[PDB]
Amino acid sequence: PPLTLEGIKDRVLYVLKLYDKIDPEKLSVNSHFMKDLGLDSLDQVEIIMAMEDEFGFEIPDIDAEKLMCPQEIVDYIADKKDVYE
Amino acid sequence: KYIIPTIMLMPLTWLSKNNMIWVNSTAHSLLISFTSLLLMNQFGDNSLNFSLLFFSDSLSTPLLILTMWLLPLMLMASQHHLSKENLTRKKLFITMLISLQLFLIMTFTAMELILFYILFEATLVPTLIIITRWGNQTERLNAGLYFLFYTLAGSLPLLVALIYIQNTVGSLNFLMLQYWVQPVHNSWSNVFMWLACMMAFMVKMPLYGLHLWLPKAHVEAPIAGSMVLAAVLLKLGGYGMLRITLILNPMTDFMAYPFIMLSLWGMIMTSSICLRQTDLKSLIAYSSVSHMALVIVAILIQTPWSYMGATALMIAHGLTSSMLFCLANSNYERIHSRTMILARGLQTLLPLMATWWLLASLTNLALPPTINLIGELFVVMSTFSWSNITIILMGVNMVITALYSLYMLIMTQRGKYTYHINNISPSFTRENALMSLHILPLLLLTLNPKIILGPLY
Amino acid sequence: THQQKVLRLYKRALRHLESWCIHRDKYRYFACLLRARFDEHKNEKDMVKATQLLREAEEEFWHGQHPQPYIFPESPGGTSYERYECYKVPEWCLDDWHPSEKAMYPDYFAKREQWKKLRRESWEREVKQLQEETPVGGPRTEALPPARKQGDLPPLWWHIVTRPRE
Amino acid sequence: XXXXXXXXXXXXXXXXXXXXXXXXXXXXXXXXXXXXXXXXXXXXXXXXXXXXXXXXXXXXXXXXXXXXXXXXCQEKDVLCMFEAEMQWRRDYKVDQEIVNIIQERLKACQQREGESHRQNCAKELEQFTQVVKAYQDRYXXXXXXXXXXXXXXXXXXXXXXXXXXXXXX
Amino acid sequence: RWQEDPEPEDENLYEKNPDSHGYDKDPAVDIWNMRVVFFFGFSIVLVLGSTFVAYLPDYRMQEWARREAERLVKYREAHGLPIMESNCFDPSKIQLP
Amino acid sequence: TGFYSKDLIIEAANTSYTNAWALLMTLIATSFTAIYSTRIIFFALLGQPRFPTLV
């Protein structure tokens, strides 16, 4: 199945909103999970595991440290899967 | 009829202009190879006689046809190599290959032990010059020195052996004359008489001991992977073992019993080393020890079945191993280092060559009957009549023959080639021609190899 | 890198939990049980006890270590299509297209000539930019991003900025 | 023909007693495929036979008999032994193919009986044991590669062992 | 330092310049060599040559002995008593002692 | 069609002069057939869907 740039912004946002750890008004698209959203150190690995399982689970531990912002996490997932031409 | 067309190939290269050369040397050798298949294939009840003994006849020699088949095939492979060198040296080189083939025609046709031996050693000098010059790697001189150190120290004992036999019993000369044969009574004086006749063909037919002669000649290759086919002809050049064991000493073969045992570990331990080695040419060089060890096991048993398998294996190895060296040539001309780990990846760059890789590697194994299965299966069935325990030793070899072919395939099937910027062009028209002209005669011998495995068949 | 050691052990614990359990509701129950274990001890600062707990974390993880782990999708190594469905023809093969055959689809050939011209002209600037960023003798582990990026072109892109896909 | 043993007579006749259904489907196809391409190939074979007309005679196999055996020619001589070596080799090539005919007779024994196989025949298995045993003890089978001089030594070795056994018993 | 030796050569054309070639230097001669005379030896010696490898050279009495054995089987069974094999080469020769 | 293949093997094997332990080992395997078949049904097919996808 084909994946688009609008599809990556829709699937990741729906998975983040369903987590119930953060409010829908608190995190929109650019609000970082490290400080702005209000997530713990254990929650950062939990959110990364949930977002990977929804789309395509291929997230290494080395890239998990770089993945902090949801806008950057959507871009890193699109880069590895080679989505949106 | 085979005297003075190869000698007429000699002035052809010198007289022809600088623009041509390669066009004349190949075309005026392919029609000569056509005439060998036209005339030599005829046989009566027993061995014939074409002429008076300058060059004699054929008894069990379709191996002569193979040399005539490689008469243009060596010129096919050395095309990218020797393209930047001097034009006078090109004329000098082709004549040296012709001279090798000239003496090779002589050795197979001449049914002597005296005329055969001096022209068997007349193939040593041209190969020495071909190895020690145009060698791409350093320390090629060790490949040159040991080439004449191992061979001549074993073969000069033939002069003290062969002349000794003809001084006692008639003359060896005509061979079909030599049926005055008295049975050897197994004495201590006859011990070294048997050994001197064998040790000359224990070097060119590689055992477990005295086998270092072969891989050094292949690793320090004469030319990339082009003149290695002449060294394949030197492997099958030890066909005098078929004639010496049959005629000179049929009774005393108690001394053959340790030599089969020495070559039995020249099957397993020579195949074990051929698993980890880095050089792609050496992975053919050590595999060529084991396939030619099969003949040494066979001949010394002296059963009629072994001769059928051996004569098939001499032709089988001459077209399969040489084909593998052409694949090693195609990889070396692009990367310029024969490291197996570095040169990794087919189909991504070489799609058509990958199918030719299969038709050359799997022939080391016993495929649907080409000539290799027909060669091997008769030998294994001959060893059982010798002793029942042999197939336990022979069965391990059947496992590592798969570890020959598939390991050559897998290390080239792994699609990566990240560091490689070269090998952009797939293959030349002459490059794929080498892959066809080696494999299609093997494919034609699948149908009826009656005129291949023929010592009274 | 003690913070990385806690995160890597926790990431492995979650993806190994799914192999032991069967249903999704049971997976959530055991994950919250794991959250009760790790969050309670991370709150206070420990110098010796934190490393002692991490070495004790090897146990339980080793008692339940191999039930064949659920590496279901296209994961690096392991099982089930690690580097598969890959023809992966490099850019080196894309230059050696034969005449009277490379004429087919001219838009791909015309664009690639502009990409090659962009790389050949900017390589001298990339060598100066890449060669400029040096601490002393050799680099201190890491890539070299563009500092004075006026026009464009980072120092070192072709394989990184030209992947085959998947 | 003649040299081949063959079956005595082939039986089988159509019964068709139980049920009607659609008769025999194999026999209905046998009449169908007889005119479909079996008749066309028979017509093409007849057309090729008619187009032959004039044919070469070909005098078949050459005779060449006796020419004195190697046992008769006493003392080693190259002129005398050469024709004797050819005579022994020609017989050895024939004796190889004699076994092959009786080998194919045993192949016919297996098929033409099928169910019985071992219990019946009785003649083909007995004829095989009469020839192979004679081939094993006289025509090499233990004397390695073929040689005319070695065969005379092998025949003398069997004769000396038989004479020593007959005189004692 | 050698002051004469450092002069490396690395030139592999293959496709760059001749477009379609088997070997370097002169494209007109190359088509006549790599594609014509190589393939005439590929056609005559392999296809017209195959009618000489196994196809009708008679070959050491392989088909001759079949017609020879068949007439000898019927001869020594109808007229003779032993089945084609009994004693080899020596009928009542000179004894050993 | 399992009755025409598998069940004729088990019934014939019971009446033999051969080893009893070899027969008893095969009899556990005939009952073992039902467990792995349900590991395709109950685990992969039956129950709540466990396919991890947004769509």
Add this chain to the structure above:
Amino acid sequence: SSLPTTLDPAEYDISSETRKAQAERLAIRSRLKREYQLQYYDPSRRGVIEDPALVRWTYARSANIYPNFRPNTKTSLLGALFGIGPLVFWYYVFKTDRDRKEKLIQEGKLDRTFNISY
């Protein structure tokens, strides 16, 4: 072969003097990487590069035959026991099989009735 548990999170120093040594590992790694990176991303290259680590790898196996093994110790004699040893081993296997076979031919016949081969 590994003896206890699979070594990955076991036996390590807790951020002591090893941290300075671990930082040195990346320094040499990047030093060989940067010279590789400079000789890769240029379009005017065309050709497989050397890499001296793999050249010395081939030299370690193919060469170093007589510069090495100049102290021929007792371990080399133990290697020679695995050398000549198996060749002399089959001498008491094949001969014992042959003397079993050859005695069965002469006294108490064991030869096959339908043996036309060999």
